[PDB]
Design a protein around this ligand. Sequence first.
Ligand SMILES: [Mg+2]
Ligand SMILES: [Mg+2]
Ligand SMILES: [Mg+2]
Ligand SMILES: [Mg+2]
Ligand SMILES: [Mg+2]
Ligand SMILES: [Mg+2]
Ligand SMILES: [Mg+2]
Ligand SMILES: [Mg+2]
Ligand SMILES: [Mg+2]
Ligand SMILES: [Mg+2]
Ligand SMILES: [Mg+2]
Ligand SMILES: [Mg+2]
Ligand SMILES: [Mg+2]
Ligand SMILES: [Mg+2]
Ligand SMILES: [Mg+2]
Ligand SMILES: [Mg+2]
Ligand SMILES: [Mg+2]
Ligand SMILES: [Mg+2]
Ligand SMILES: [Mg+2]
Ligand SMILES: [Mg+2]
Ligand SMILES: [Mg+2]
Ligand SMILES: [Mg+2]
Ligand SMILES: [Mg+2]
Ligand SMILES: [Mg+2]
Ligand SMILES: [Mg+2]
Ligand SMILES: [Mg+2]
Ligand SMILES: [Mg+2]
Ligand SMILES: [Mg+2]
Ligand SMILES: [Mg+2]
Ligand SMILES: [Mg+2]
Ligand SMILES: [Mg+2]
Ligand SMILES: [Mg+2]
Ligand SMILES: [Mg+2]
Ligand SMILES: [Mg+2]
Ligand SMILES: [Mg+2]
Ligand SMILES: [Mg+2]
Ligand SMILES: [Mg+2]
Ligand SMILES: [Mg+2]
Ligand SMILES: [Mg+2]
Ligand SMILES: [Mg+2]
Ligand SMILES: [Mg+2]
Ligand SMILES: [Mg+2]
Ligand SMILES: [Mg+2]
Ligand SMILES: [Mg+2]
Ligand SMILES: [Mg+2]
Ligand SMILES: [Mg+2]
Ligand SMILES: [Mg+2]
Ligand SMILES: [Mg+2]
Ligand SMILES: [Mg+2]
Ligand SMILES: [Mg+2]
Ligand SMILES: [Mg+2]
Ligand SMILES: [Mg+2]
Ligand SMILES: [Mg+2]
Ligand SMILES: [Mg+2]
Ligand SMILES: [Mg+2]
Ligand SMILES: [Mg+2]
Ligand SMILES: [Mg+2]
Ligand SMILES: [Mg+2]
Ligand SMILES: [Mg+2]
Ligand SMILES: [Mg+2]
Ligand SMILES: [Mg+2]
Ligand SMILES: [Mg+2]
Ligand SMILES: [Mg+2]
Ligand SMILES: [Mg+2]
Ligand SMILES: [Mg+2]
Ligand SMILES: [Mg+2]
Ligand SMILES: [Mg+2]
Ligand SMILES: [Mg+2]
Ligand SMILES: [Mg+2]
Ligand SMILES: [Mg+2]
Ligand SMILES: [Mg+2]
Ligand SMILES: [Mg+2]
Ligand SMILES: [Mg+2]
Ligand SMILES: [Mg+2]
Ligand SMILES: [Mg+2]
Ligand SMILES: [Mg+2]
Ligand SMILES: [Mg+2]
Ligand SMILES: [Mg+2]
Ligand SMILES: [Mg+2]
Ligand SMILES: [Mg+2]
Ligand SMILES: [Mg+2]
Ligand SMILES: [Mg+2]
Ligand SMILES: [Mg+2]
Ligand SMILES: [Mg+2]
Ligand SMILES: [Mg+2]
Lengths: 122, 131
Amino acid sequence: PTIQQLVRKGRRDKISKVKTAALKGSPQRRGVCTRVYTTTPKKPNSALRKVARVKLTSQVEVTAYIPGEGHNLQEHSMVLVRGGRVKDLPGVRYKIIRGSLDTQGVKNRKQARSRYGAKKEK
Amino acid sequence: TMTDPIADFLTRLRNANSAYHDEVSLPHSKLKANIAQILKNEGYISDFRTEDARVGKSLVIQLKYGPSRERSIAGLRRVSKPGLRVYAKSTNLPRVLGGLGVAIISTSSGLLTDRQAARQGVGGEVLAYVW
RNA sequence: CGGGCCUUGUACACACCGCCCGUCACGUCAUGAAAGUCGGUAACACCCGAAGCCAGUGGCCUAACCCUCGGGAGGGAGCUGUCGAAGGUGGGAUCGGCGAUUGGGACGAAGUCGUAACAAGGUAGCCGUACCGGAAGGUGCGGCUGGAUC
RNA sequence: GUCUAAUACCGGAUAGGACCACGGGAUGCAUGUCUUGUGGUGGAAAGCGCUUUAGCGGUGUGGGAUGAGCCCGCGGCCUAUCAGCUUGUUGGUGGGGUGACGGCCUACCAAGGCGACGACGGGUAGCCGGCCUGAGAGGGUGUCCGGCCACACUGGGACUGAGAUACGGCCCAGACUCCUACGGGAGGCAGCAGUGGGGAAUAUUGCACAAUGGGCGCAAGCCUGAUGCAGCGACGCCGCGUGGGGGAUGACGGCCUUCGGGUUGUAAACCUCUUUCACCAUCGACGAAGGUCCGGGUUCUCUCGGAUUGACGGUAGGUGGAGAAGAAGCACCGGCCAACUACGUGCCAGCAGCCGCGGUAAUACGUAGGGUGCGAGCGUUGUCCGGAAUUACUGGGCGUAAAGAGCUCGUAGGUGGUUUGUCGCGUUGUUCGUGAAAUCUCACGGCUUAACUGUGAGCGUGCGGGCGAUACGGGCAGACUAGAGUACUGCAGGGGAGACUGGAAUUCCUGGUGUAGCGGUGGAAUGCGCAGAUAUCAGGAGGAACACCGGUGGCGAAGGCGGGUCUCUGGGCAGUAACUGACGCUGAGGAGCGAAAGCGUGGGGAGCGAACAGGAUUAGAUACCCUGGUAGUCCACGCCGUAAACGGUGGGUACUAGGUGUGGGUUUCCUUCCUUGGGAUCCGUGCCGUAGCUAACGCAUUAAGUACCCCGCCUGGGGAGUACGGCC
RNA sequence: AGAAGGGGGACCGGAAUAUCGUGAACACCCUUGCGGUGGGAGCGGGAUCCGGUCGCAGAAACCAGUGAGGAGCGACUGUU
Ligand SMILES: [Mg+2]
Ligand SMILES: [Mg+2]
Ligand SMILES: [Mg+2]
Ligand SMILES: [Mg+2]
Ligand SMILES: [Mg+2]
Ligand SMILES: [Mg+2]
Ligand SMILES: [Mg+2]
Ligand SMILES: [Mg+2]
Ligand SMILES: [Mg+2]
Ligand SMILES: [Mg+2]
Ligand SMILES: [Mg+2]
Ligand SMILES: [Mg+2]
Ligand SMILES: [Mg+2]
Ligand SMILES: [Mg+2]
Ligand SMILES: [Mg+2]
Ligand SMILES: [Mg+2]
Ligand SMILES: [Mg+2]
Ligand SMILES: [Mg+2]
Ligand SMILES: [Mg+2]
Ligand SMILES: [Mg+2]
Ligand SMILES: [Mg+2]
Ligand SMILES: [Mg+2]
Ligand SMILES: [Mg+2]
Ligand SMILES: [Mg+2]
Ligand SMILES: [Mg+2]
Ligand SMILES: [Mg+2]
Ligand SMILES: [Mg+2]
Ligand SMILES: [Mg+2]
Ligand SMILES: [Mg+2]
Ligand SMILES: [Mg+2]
Ligand SMILES: [Mg+2]
Ligand SMILES: [Mg+2]
Ligand SMILES: [Mg+2]
Ligand SMILES: [Mg+2]
Ligand SMILES: [Mg+2]
Ligand SMILES: [Mg+2]
Ligand SMILES: [Mg+2]
Ligand SMILES: [Mg+2]
Ligand SMILES: [Mg+2]
Ligand SMILES: [Mg+2]
Ligand SMILES: [Mg+2]
Ligand SMILES: [Mg+2]
Ligand SMILES: [Mg+2]
Ligand SMILES: [Mg+2]
Ligand SMILES: [Mg+2]
Ligand SMILES: [Mg+2]
Ligand SMILES: [Mg+2]
Ligand SMILES: [Mg+2]
Ligand SMILES: [Mg+2]
Ligand SMILES: [Mg+2]
Ligand SMILES: [Mg+2]
Ligand SMILES: [Mg+2]
Ligand SMILES: [Mg+2]
Ligand SMILES: [Mg+2]
Ligand SMILES: [Mg+2]
Ligand SMILES: [Mg+2]
Ligand SMILES: [Mg+2]
Ligand SMILES: [Mg+2]
Ligand SMILES: [Mg+2]
Ligand SMILES: [Mg+2]
Ligand SMILES: [Mg+2]
Ligand SMILES: [Mg+2]
Ligand SMILES: [Mg+2]
Ligand SMILES: [Mg+2]
Ligand SMILES: [Mg+2]
Ligand SMILES: [Mg+2]
Ligand SMILES: [Mg+2]
Ligand SMILES: [Mg+2]
Ligand SMILES: [Mg+2]
Ligand SMILES: [Mg+2]
Ligand SMILES: [Mg+2]
Ligand SMILES: [Mg+2]
Ligand SMILES: [Mg+2]
Ligand SMILES: [Mg+2]
Ligand SMILES: [Mg+2]
Ligand SMILES: [Mg+2]
Ligand SMILES: [Mg+2]
Ligand SMILES: [Mg+2]
Ligand SMILES: [Mg+2]
Ligand SMILES: [Mg+2]
Ligand SMILES: [Mg+2]
Ligand SMILES: [Mg+2]
Ligand SMILES: [Mg+2]
Ligand SMILES: [Mg+2]
Ligand SMILES: [Mg+2]
């Protein structure tokens, strides 16, 4: 509008909010995984969800989802955490990768068998 | 106030062509006369000429229409603006409607359109596209 | 009380048994304030100042030259001042953290009190402002129609 | 403490490219540049070997080549919630210092320089050819390679030398590890490795100097973690395999089933054929018209032609032997999106990017089967671009969706009517130079093709010089009246300010009459009165607002403005064409004006009336209704600076059917037929409507149409016009 | 607010004959005066800069503010 207006003050793009935090440019980052527990989703989709309060190696604290069924995580398991946000829960924005240091792959997994962590067979 | 009588002239052209006016009158300037000359010899209008106005010169141009009531100009657009001047070299001249329209080019060789500018070898100011 | 036709208003469409506002209570999270407190950063002023360059002094040392053979000439060691990093002192600036206590916000649940708005929403509604009130809100003054009436 | 040299050191003689002074001769771009002359001063060196034409040196200088130093135009992040920064700072003189100009430093003198085109400051960051993405413009990024810069444990400084951030040099301070006999010393992997530590995460303490580049020596030769390679990581790209031709009774098994069958499926069994890759065996490299020795070479050179020299490496590669033989997994299948049935589970497990699925029949969870897409890869994450025309230059918008500042004036800036001549800065044409190499594109060439490489042609958009041009923009010197302003004559108006002043009405007071009610409501009550109320008459006090005119109207930038008179005063409109001659438009900031409420001081206070109180209503009633009633409303002077300050529509200008009102002028025809009719034109102000525009509503000559100039503003909703800071 | 917190301070010499600023004489010029123009002697004052010298110490003895931060009350000077 009135190109002189553009030269006095140029077009400046809207601030792109950082989609993922607590990891600081890290595709994955590990955490000591305190306070594993189970929480409820929103008004629809009434269920129980396995989440963990992770002290990440950015010296931060976040909430992560435990994908799949079953976990051996109690209070101090060295977990690897990546992105991915669940729709149902408000404060969940991260996911522990199954099949890492102290997160075993989900048992009895024969379909897709790379997510959730799983060797083929013996 | 009255800025860019070039755009004033071509907007008078647009408004009267859209209103199916046989003829338009406006102030005369040498640039307007040469623009009307280009419009003539490119075939977008019929004759133009000049009155003895009360002050200055008065430029009247006639608008040609087809056998039925179809516009001989499909539109037009000022391109060089007093708020933004646009210049084009002979090697990168604008192409109006891919060629079916023309662009008035101001050059050291005087006012001359896209074909003359390309095959004469100089570019420069691009006043408007008529098409 | 219910029903039908036309028009009007509507934020209702589960269709007024609709929708919907705000406190209060419960939970979670982000965040503001806060006596104070813990850090960082960059300067500034002054003090002390290494090495080091520079400017002065230089009895102690001395192979290149002269010489009257006595020595001399030329140089060196050593000593002081200016500037100077670091350090010290001080008062500010500035960026952060924590903080008893306190304030609002957002999201949550089938909680409590009302019913403020949407129909003339039951006192038309909104705007600014002022005062008042558990709370939505009420009222005054001016304004608007994003309301009405003749 | 003795003793010994040198191409180490010192002293000399001569030697112009030191100097000074005076001059010539050429050129300019000013301090200035070169070639010379005269005179007076000055400064350099060196030797080392020999088969008897083995050879290495040195010094003074003129010019090249190369490297470098410095300076400058342009370009390249965020931020004003950073507006005042600068004293050796700005300049000069005389000096010093430097290789060199230079406040680079110093004595003196003056008081200048930078900045809203963003100084100073805060935050972030190595920069680039490039790389990623995109149609491009753009956006992200700066990793391999290459160029430039900076640094070398942290901080400060000098030395040698042509050349110094002097990584593996020196001096000092500081922090850290080690030895000491405690006095004292040593060390700096961001070189090649490699170790520990952080992380989600990135490797061998290998070989060769075979080649090239480099260092040194007459040379052979020695050094080179440069370099060539080699090992490990699917880390990425490319290439190739894990068989092929037949092969139905369309076999078993599996799955589904409407129980007749379908599907896996020529896919299998079987026959037949050939061995890319892997296996064994063997030969065996190019990279070396190279590097040295010994025959001959007329000497420099050259080969007839003989020995020997490759880390890669017995590697790549050729050939023989054997037989389908040793070699496939990953993801997904509701829509985007290509790919479906069954069983197990039953808001549970769980899936998911999105919107959604699962609560007894799940194409959406787990398993099976089938299928799809891939394939030594397939998925998840993270990051970036795209889609996103959702920051819009290309390429967006602001009446009601987010968006016109409340209004105006005006600073910087942006922008600018008609015409003449010139400059040629922009613009534009051409050439020259540069725009390294590599990268990207085109064409060939070779590694078995490919990835990769090489060559030739584009790219290198930009910049500098010369020669053209002046149409447009810009500068200059002019001109014109059309925009703008002035003058003159008229005109309309609630435009503003001050003073005085008028009447109605309300309230109160004084009196006259007069008696029992008045008031108020949906109905009441509180309340007023019986001490004389309400009512009615007369007089008086006071305050506020100015009925009828009055309108749909007029005026004002907006907010707003009307009882009358007087005084002062602003703007607007029309006409004449008398004057100026573009003086215009807009306007970041800024300044002024700015309803009502509110605030300060002082007045005033009838009526009304936030608060308050009572009454009523009500479940409650902090309300609506009633009765009172304080601030306030009014005045003067300040402050506030906000409104649905709205046409929810910024200003200016030009153009684009009309129809009909109304307000203010001017002008022509029946002109005296008065008719104060008809027409034209200027400026308003409304309604309706065409084209056009719009999501629609609607706007529509007073645009929300068609265009141009300038400004303000928006980028999903909340959080929030809030916090923090700052200004008032 | 003298916020706080710092620095300098003595003597001698030079700058220094007009350094500078105060006061203004002999002898020259002009409307004749307790007059005016210049002129600068001696006499005092202050400040700076440079160099040197001395001590433990230069404000020299005597003299001569402690400062900062947070509350309560009272505004304040005053009065009892
Ligand atoms: Mg009927
Ligand atoms: Mg709460
Ligand atoms: Mg805080
Ligand atoms: Mg010293
Ligand atoms: Mg707290
Ligand atoms: Mg209500
Ligand atoms: Mg209400
Ligand atoms: Mg009600
Ligand atoms: Mg209501
Ligand atoms: Mg209100
Ligand atoms: Mg009230
Ligand atoms: Mg009102
Ligand atoms: Mg000897
Ligand atoms: Mg000699
Ligand atoms: Mg000599
Ligand atoms: Mg030699
Ligand atoms: Mg100086
Ligand atoms: Mg000088
Ligand atoms: Mg000099
Ligand atoms: Mg950095
Ligand atoms: Mg695109
Ligand atoms: Mg680089
Ligand atoms: Mg790197
Ligand atoms: Mg280190
Ligand atoms: Mg040197
Ligand atoms: Mg080293
Ligand atoms: Mg290394
Ligand atoms: Mg680790
Ligand atoms: Mg070598
Ligand atoms: Mg390698
Ligand atoms: Mg590989
Ligand atoms: Mg891997
Ligand atoms: Mg491939
Ligand atoms: Mg073979
Ligand atoms: Mg599909
Ligand atoms: Mg089922
Ligand atoms: Mg599934
Ligand atoms: Mg993703
Ligand atoms: Mg875009
Ligand atoms: Mg995206
Ligand atoms: Mg848009
Ligand atoms: Mg607009
Ligand atoms: Mg809006
Ligand atoms: Mg407006
Ligand atoms: Mg104006
Ligand atoms: Mg203006
Ligand atoms: Mg201006
Ligand atoms: Mg201009
Ligand atoms: Mg012009
Ligand atoms: Mg080929
Ligand atoms: Mg090829
Ligand atoms: Mg190539
Ligand atoms: Mg190139
Ligand atoms: Mg005019
Ligand atoms: Mg008036
Ligand atoms: Mg009266
Ligand atoms: Mg009264
Ligand atoms: Mg009476
Ligand atoms: Mg009475
Ligand atoms: Mg004139
Ligand atoms: Mg402004
Ligand atoms: Mg004002
Ligand atoms: Mg008021
Ligand atoms: Mg007041
Ligand atoms: Mg008050
Ligand atoms: Mg008062
Ligand atoms: Mg009341
Ligand atoms: Mg009450
Ligand atoms: Mg007044
Ligand atoms: Mg506002
Ligand atoms: Mg208004
Ligand atoms: Mg607005
Ligand atoms: Mg407009
Ligand atoms: Mg009109
Ligand atoms: Mg209309
Ligand atoms: Mg529109
Ligand atoms: Mg938002
Ligand atoms: Mg605020
Ligand atoms: Mg504040
Ligand atoms: Mg003090
Ligand atoms: Mg003295
Ligand atoms: Mg001294
Ligand atoms: Mg002493
Ligand atoms: Mg007291
Ligand atoms: Mg006192």
